[PDB]
Design a protein around this ligand. Structure first.
Ligand code: HEM
Ligand code: HEM
Ligand SMILES: O=C(O)[C@@H]1CCCNN1
Lengths: 212, 213
């Protein structure tokens, strides 16, 4: 359901899980009614926080998300919507100047995970509050500064009615790791070296370093 | 509208949406899946019509150019006059309530997004396919590159051209999400802006926050 050329497959299933954890603000897409363009909403999605033990594969697990119930996308999902959620990681423009070869064409290195399955809306106030608390736990740990939600739990309950929490059972998962694997080894090394020298591109260089 | 954007997160000026498209040309192109399936999503390079002169302040009514792989099933799936959305994602950063130094609070994610909607029309001519990719080099190498000169590769482009699926997208609708702490009180907005200015990873978000009225 996602087109990934052979050379851009992750070396291990765990790479797709690592991208979802590192880039939780996903683009959630569902079909537009009457041949209209898809609905797209940026939503915070995490892996099922009740999974204990290493999560090596996305297929078969449940993701947890929320959006604004007042967003018209929530009404458009209906009951049993087949959805895609796209997670986008590190990326960078590849200048052929870096290759020091000729002839050439530029490209864009990038990382994507597309997960597909059925979206189920959460109606339970308990499950909705679990969703947003788990999201805080996961994102404050990875991206934040040790903020303690304990003193804000009453506030969470006060604004809870606006939350559209959901569950996405992952039927299909595809990962684009477009990282110059199509180039000859010395050229891949020149790209990696070039991306090492600047903050905007170091995370791409980091992934290129981890390919077998 | 086709994109949900709370009032506080509207761009100050139409120009902000054009700027984000120019800044973040690798868009997520979405069209409907067949028979209830989830949408097809492809990352594709997309540029403003290179023939526009004058300041470009508004996306609505301009044509965007882009290309993708013909081998990608998404190309066949678009068929004729497919209604599509292309989403451009700019600077973004998680907002810890630790930065607010206020209670109670909840975290958020500051982010920027432009969604353009209209009818994708395929280019089938080799001449307009070659134009598409040469215009894309000119626009992207200048903005993101390292002074590469395509001159030596102009014939090479023609020698690798058949796999290119070039397209045009006339923008019927453009919506912009500029989620940049506009909902917070001014003193809290300033604390987020100063926190984001203290690391290169978040400086671009701080830059946009600094340009709000
Ligand atoms: C932990 C990080 C969190 C992030 C990144 C986050 C992000 C978001 C985003 C992006 C939306 C808008 C979705 C749309 O456009 O429909 C949203 C909506 C909402 N979220 Fe969260 N959220 C988080 C935690 C929470 C918490 C802890 C609560 C507590 C109840 C909460 C309550 C809401 C509510 C009420 C809305 C809908 C109304 C509104 O957006 O103001 N969120 N959230
Ligand atoms: C200027 C920057 C460029 C960028 C960022 C870029 C980006 C891309 C991307 C992301 C794809 C894959 C789309 C998909 O999954 O369907 C694509 C496909 C393609 N591009 Fe470009 N493109 C660039 C310039 C060029 C140029 C100058 C040529 C010359 C003909 C070209 C030839 C192709 C071809 C043949 C394909 C089909 C698949 C393949 O062979 O890789 N591109 N391009
Ligand atoms: O993201 C926001 O700004 C709103 C308020 C608090 C956290 N999630 N919804």
């Amino acid at each position: 359901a996602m087109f990934v050329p052979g050379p851009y497959h992750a070396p291990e299933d765990r790479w797709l899980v690592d991208l979802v954890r590192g880039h939780p603000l996903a683009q959630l897409a569902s079909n537009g009614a009457g041949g209209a363009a898809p609905h797209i909403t940026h939503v915070p999605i995490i892996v099922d926080p009740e999974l204990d033990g290493p999560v090596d594969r996305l297929v078969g697990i449940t993701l947890w998300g929320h959006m604004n119930r007042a967003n018209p996308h929530w009404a458009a999902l209906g009951g049993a919507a087949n959805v895609v959620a796209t997670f986008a990681g590190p990326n960078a423009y590849v200048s052929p100047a870096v290759y020091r070869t000729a002839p050439a064409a530029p490209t864009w290195n990038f990382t994507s995970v597309q997960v597909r399955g059925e979206l189920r809306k959460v109606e339970s106030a308990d499950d909705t509050l679990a969703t947003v608390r788990a999201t805080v736990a996961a994102l404050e740990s990875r991206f934040g500064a040790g903020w303690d939600m304990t003193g804000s739990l009453d506030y969470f309950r006060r604004i809870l009615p606006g939350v559209g929490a959901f569950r996405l059972r992952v039927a299909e998962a595809d990962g684009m790791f477009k990282l110059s694997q199509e180039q000859q080894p010395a050229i891949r090394r020149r790209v990696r070296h070039s991306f090492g020298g600047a903050e905007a591109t170091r995370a791409v260089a980091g992934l290129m370093d981890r390919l077998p």
